[PDB]
Amino acid sequence: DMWIERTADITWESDAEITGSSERVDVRLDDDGNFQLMGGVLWDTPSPKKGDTTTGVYRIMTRGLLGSYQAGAGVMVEGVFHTLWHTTKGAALMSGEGRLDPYWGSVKEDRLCYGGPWKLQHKWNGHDEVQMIVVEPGKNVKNVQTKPGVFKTPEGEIGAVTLDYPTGTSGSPIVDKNGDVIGLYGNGVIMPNGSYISAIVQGE
Numbered sequence: 001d002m003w004i005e006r007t008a009d010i011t012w013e014s015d016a017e018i019t020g021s022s023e024r025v026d027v028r029l030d031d032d033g034n035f036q037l038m039g040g041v042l043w044d045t046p047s048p049k050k051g052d053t054t055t056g057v058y059r060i061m062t063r064g065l066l067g068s069y070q071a072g073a074g075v076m077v078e079g080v081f082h083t084l085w086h087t088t089k090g091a092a093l094m095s096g097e098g099r100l101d102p103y104w105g106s107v108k109e110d111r112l113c114y115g116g117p118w119k120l121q122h123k124w125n126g127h128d129e130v131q132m133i134v135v136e137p138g139k140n141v142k143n144v145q146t147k148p149g150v151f152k153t154p155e156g157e158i159g160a161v162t163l164d165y166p167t168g169t170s171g172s173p174i175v176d177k178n179g180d181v182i183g184l185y186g187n188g189v190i191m192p193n194g195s196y197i198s199a200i201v202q203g204e
């Protein structure tokens, strides 16, 4: 029922609009993957697609008997598709002529990958501006540039971006100036003034 469509290259854009703000907010993370203001599962082996694993940025689409809608987005790097867990909850994804089955995910970290282990090892350097590759439903892909702030958790810190986009943009990748994916958009908190702030969702 769900499929992926390639829609952009993974790149830094020199003309991106600069927006957002660099906040600092105290949060805790629950075992369902929700942040509040203040583990990993290896999936079944296919066992016996061939989906398309071309590098790039992708929309996650779904449909029933009528038109389609955009459930989310993600990134294909080194033959593995990466998204937030909550976009698909582990559902299989068609990719071109074949199927991609989940490999590994964590509800609490809100991360899921298909085709192999997580390939994205780069992280925000804690200093520089970053770019979100915005995969908004119904719209062409564009990049926006921002300086992250920080979620302060009881154990540590996580980079966080004050950028609000509509439902279905979750899983859009965030890149550093080299064009390396430093994490994904779409799991955060709402502030008392209504501002939405997402973690830069990434492994170690």
Ligand SMILES: *[B@@]1([C]([C][C][C][N]C([N])=[N])[N]C(=O)[C]([C]C2=[C][C]=C([C][N])[C]=[C]2)[N]C(=O)C2=[C][C]=[C][C]=[C]2)O[C][C]([C][O])O1
Pocket (backbone or CB within 6 Å): 032, 033, 034, 071, 072, 086, 087, 110, 164, 165, 166, 167, 168, 169, 170, 171, 186, 187, 188, 189, 190, 196
């Ligand atoms: B995303 C969507 C992108 C941001 C939309 N903007 C906004 N809500 N103002 N992300 C969210 O809405 C997430 C969803 C989510 C789902 C599941 C988990 C793990 N249990 C965590 C987050 N919501 C928030 O981050 C949120 C936190 C606190 C209060 C309100 C909202 O695009 C496709 C999918 C839709 O679920 O996500």
